[PDB]
Amino acid sequence: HHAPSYRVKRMDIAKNDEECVVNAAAPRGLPGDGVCKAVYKKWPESFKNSATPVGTAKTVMCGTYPVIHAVGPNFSNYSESEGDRELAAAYREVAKEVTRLGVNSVAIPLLSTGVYSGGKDRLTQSLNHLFTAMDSTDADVVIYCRDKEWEKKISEAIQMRT
Ligand SMILES: Nc1ncnc2c1ncn2[C@@H]1O[C@H](COP(=O)(O)OP(=O)(O)OC[C@H]2O[C@@H](O)[C@H](O)[C@@H]2O)[C@@H](O)[C@H]1O
Description:
It is classed as viral protein,hydrolase. Keywords: Chikungunya virus, ADP-ribose, AViDD, Advanced Light Source 8.3.1, viral protein, hydrolase. It forms a monomeric assembly. It is built from four helices and six strands, in the order ββαββαβαβα. The protein has 162 residues and is an alpha/beta fold. It has one domain (6-159): Leucine Aminopeptidase, subunit E, domain 1. Strands 1-6-5 form a three-stranded parallel β-sheet, covered by helices on one side. A three-stranded mixed β-sheet has the order 2-4-3, sandwiched between helices.
């Protein structure tokens, strides 16, 4: 009867202490410069056939460690309304994969808030879609970020719901 939790840590997600990781991935499965740079350095084997459409997630094992490649929309290319829909959908697929995998915990970044943000601050938009998808799972969720002001805002959002 474990109590599922949310936490946020400001550090490289490749150093996570959870049972699986979510990559903020690209649709063609190519290595990138954000989270995906770290994921490719740490779990390169998980990039075999990791390509998957925008708005979806695809899990590839590195050994027995699952890497869930979730592809948020690039808001430079999508309208605000369609990009919002694809971002929500990518997180829904993450929740389904976390559940299917049976893991007790997952390390997760904020999708579409960096390289794919279209130059806008999307912390709240992305975090709220994360909660909408993950709230109904019972895995411990650890959100990884790099910006010190974002850490505070994410922490505040978590705490105000408890
Ligand atoms: N190693 C990291 N650990 C934790 N957070 C990180 C890390 N690297 C970046 N971040 C932060 O994670 C959030 C998501 O940013 P991106 O990784 O750039 O993801 P996204 O906006 O979804 O862009 C995906 C695209 O970037 C490429 O890396 C990827 O291959 C894809 O083409 C941002 O707030 C970013 O500052």
